[PDB]
Amino acid sequence: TPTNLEQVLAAGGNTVEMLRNSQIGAYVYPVVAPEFSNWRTEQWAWRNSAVLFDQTHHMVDLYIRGKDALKLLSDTMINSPKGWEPNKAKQYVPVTPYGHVIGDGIIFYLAEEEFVYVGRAPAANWLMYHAQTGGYNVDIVHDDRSPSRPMGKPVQRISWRFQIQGPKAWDVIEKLHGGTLEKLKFFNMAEMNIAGMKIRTLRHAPGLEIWGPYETQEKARNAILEAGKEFGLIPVGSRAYPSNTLESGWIPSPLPAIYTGDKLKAYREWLPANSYEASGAIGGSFVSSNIEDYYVNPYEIGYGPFVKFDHDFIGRDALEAIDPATQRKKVTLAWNGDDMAKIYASLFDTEADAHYKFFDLPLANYANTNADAVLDAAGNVVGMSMFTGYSYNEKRALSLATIDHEIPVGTELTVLWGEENGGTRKTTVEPHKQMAVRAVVSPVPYSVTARETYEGGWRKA
Ligand SMILES: [Cl-]
Ligand SMILES: [N+]
Ligand code: NA
User: Fold this and answer.
1) How far, in Å, from the CA of 120 to the mean position of ligand 1?
2) Which domain of life, per UniProt?
3) Using N-to-C axis directions, what is the helix angle for 121-133 and 69-76, rounded to 10°?
4) Residue 154 belongs to what H/E stretch?
């Protein structure tokens, strides 16, 4: 039986068909209670009071130490390493030799020769592969995300990681600290007081990400919850937590673009057969027999400004060949509310042969990687919708998408919701029929945009 991704792909037929029919099940945000009050009030609180996000369990952590730690990062990231020093974090974005996004995550520069990566599995795997096979003088400690279904088992992480966010977040933070606390610039790191402990901070309406050794997790949680009551702070569960990004604009789920190309053959031979890459799933209406049509490059998902050709890095030549002006662009799509009502109404039709794909709330994704076709009035595919749910703050279904560069803000397109042929074999997919949902191109981060009218609907020139 296959022991690595390369063997999995060789034995598994068409790669798209494999991923689109994977049996992995839901992409789960583990361990944290689904809800503490209810997801609607929890969503409301991060806009109107304050929240504690529990980020301890859904991300892979990679502790990177040694003389070559910074070089490893520089060699593999599009980001400029110039001027980088401890107590500044970056959004680490690696591309392949072909210029496609592998993944992304937050890399903390904790001290000289000491970094930590926090993010989904794929960029951590890529980092580990280059540390292990590239001769770097570095030491790596990998700490997996928590199990999707603990079923009563104990769960252990090396660190706990929280965020305090919302309009009253700083009031809570200064109450915990015991006095005024300087608001540093975005992604600069410092420390604060919590219950007599020195807690390191990352500046994220200002808020903070905080972290510490797993063993002090409840001591920190309890102090934050107690201090925050005065300002209406509440804890957010795992049901509401992942939908925040629908408002903030970050696409979590680019397909790791590592399935083709002989410059990636050795990486595929290194990746385990039960890796995210080998075992994950793709969900949605976009169908191509070519897995490369699911790849994205940094310019398409908002990382263009990160690309700096001031250092050597994997894929630099391919990125230099890209014309930024013509690339797809990240947008928020605002889904039509009548169409949403029609999706949900179909669940209560006892006579219809089929209903529309179930749209879970507040997060509607049903695979690791999401890929719904976005269409114009002529049926041209003009975009790919990549993360989907609902905001109780806006009273709107929303999706994050990358679409053709020339499409004006305010354009009404359609998102094809659901899968063909009654559904793929994914275990998250009930039998259903498809629906074209009207959706209005809006900014990212989302803001309400007036729908523009075009005679006969907007279509490509
Ligand atoms: Cl995530
Ligand atoms: N904000
Ligand atoms: Na950067």
Assistant:
1) 6
2) Bacteria
3) 120
4) none
> Which uninterrupted H or E stretch holds 172?
helix 169-177
* Other beta carbons less than 10 A from residue 281's beta carbon: 24
Which ligand sits closest to the CA of 57? 1
204 alpha carbon, distance to own chain's centre:
16
What spacing in Å lies between the alpha carbon of 303 and ligand 3's midpoint?
Answer: 9
Here the tokens at position 326 are 């013509």
Q: β-strands 233-236, 50-54: how paired?
A: parallel
Domain ranges of the chain: 1-461
CB atoms closer than 10 angstroms to residue 325: 7
* 234 Cα–ligand 2 center, Å: 18
Q: Which residue has the tokens 């770097």?
A: 136
Q: Minimal CA–CA distance to 333: which of 434, 272, 433, 251?
A: 251
Point out the ligand nearest to the CA of residue 47: 2
Distance of CA 379 to the CA centre of its chain: 28
Q: For residue 321, give both structure tokens.
A: 């060949």
Q: What is the resolution of this structure in A?
A: 1.8
Which among 245, 242, 243, 249 has a CA at the least distance from the CA of 402? 249
The 197-203 sheet, strands edge to edge: 189-194, 197-203, 208-213, 159-165, 50-54, 233-236
Residue 192 near residue 208 (C-beta atoms within 8 A): yes
What lies within 8 Å, CB to CB, of 104 at 6+ separation is 91, 92, 93, 94, 119, 120, 123, 254, 303
Residue with tokens 């490369």: 292
Q: Tokens 């972290």: give the residue.
A: 211
Structure tokens at 432: 């259903």
- Residues 52, 63: contact at Cβ < 8 Å? no
Query: What is the rounded CA–CA span in Å between residue 414 and residue 444?
Result: 18
Entry field: residues in the chain: 461
